Design a protein around this ligand. Sequence first.
Ligand code: CL
Ligand code: MG
Length: 161
Amino acid sequence: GMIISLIAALAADRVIGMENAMPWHLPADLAWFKRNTLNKPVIMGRKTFESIGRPLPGRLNIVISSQPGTDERVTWAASIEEALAFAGNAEEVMVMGGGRVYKQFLDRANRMYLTHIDAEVGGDTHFPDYEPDEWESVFSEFHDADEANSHSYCFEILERR
Ligand SMILES: [Cl-]
Ligand SMILES: [Mg+2]
């Protein structure tokens, strides 16, 4: 029954490396939900963890790596199944490791939080293909660029149907 959520910021189909540890831009009318997310485990790949250089505070950080762990504040896993086991009985686990991590988690995932920022330069990895018939866009909100938003964006929540 765990909510297994892929969270990614995308320029077209390319994953953006976001400055904020959590790769989203929440609209004002969903900012309340940020408070809910602070105890949920995060799962990410080794390269994403290195780009952050420290764990996200106040929650379990699970890093998937084929190499020995480099930070005692993290729980290290060698597979997505091990990573999900470490999340235990969490209501929701956030996944944000690289395009490979998104691809390996897609069949087990049941929610996505996608921030589309199509004027940004995307990175060197593509978000995995997913089947439109399996996923419902349940919430979608666009905001234009303005004095408080350097980029226009659309925040979308997908859930499996
Ligand atoms: Cl909870
Ligand atoms: Mg930018």
